């Protein structure tokens, strides 16, 4: 139903705010994105940057995959990310998320015409 592309987006991109400034970014933001609807994410990461900057890492430095493939790159600079992981005192439908916030270099898989992110490998 959703394209890889567009999954990658809804899971991956928050243009709206510079870096989480709330220990609750995590919950609201799983939440928002529809990452609980059916059961709790374990892990995402959400990163501050604009489309434009995280499409262009398509284009950037290939390195391998975590499983091999060789379509992903790792943006040349660090960008603002917030990781979220499900928390010991999670439990669907009440889940609940600690959120890291950092700088950090990413990894994307990218596919396609045009050539975009579709997976967001172990960011830097």
Do not use: W
Not at 74 to 98: L, V
Not at 106 to 116: F, K, L
């Amino acid at each position: 139903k959703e394209t890889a592309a567009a999954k990658f987006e809804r899971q991956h991109m928050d243009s709206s705010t510079s870096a989480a400034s709330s220990s609750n970014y995590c919950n609201q933001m799983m939440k928002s994105r529809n990452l609980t609807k059916d059961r709790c994410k374990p892990v995402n990461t959400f990163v501050h940057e604009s489309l434009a900057d995280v499409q262009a890492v398509c284009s950037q430095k290939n390195v391998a995959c975590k499983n091999g493939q060789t379509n992903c790159y790792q943006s040349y600079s660090t960008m603002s990310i917030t990781d979220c992981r499900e928390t010991g005192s999670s439990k669907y439908p009440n889940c609940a998320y600690k959120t890291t916030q950092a700088n950090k270099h990413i990894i994307v898989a990218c596919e396609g015409n045009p050539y975009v992110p579709v997976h967001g490998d172990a960011s830097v």
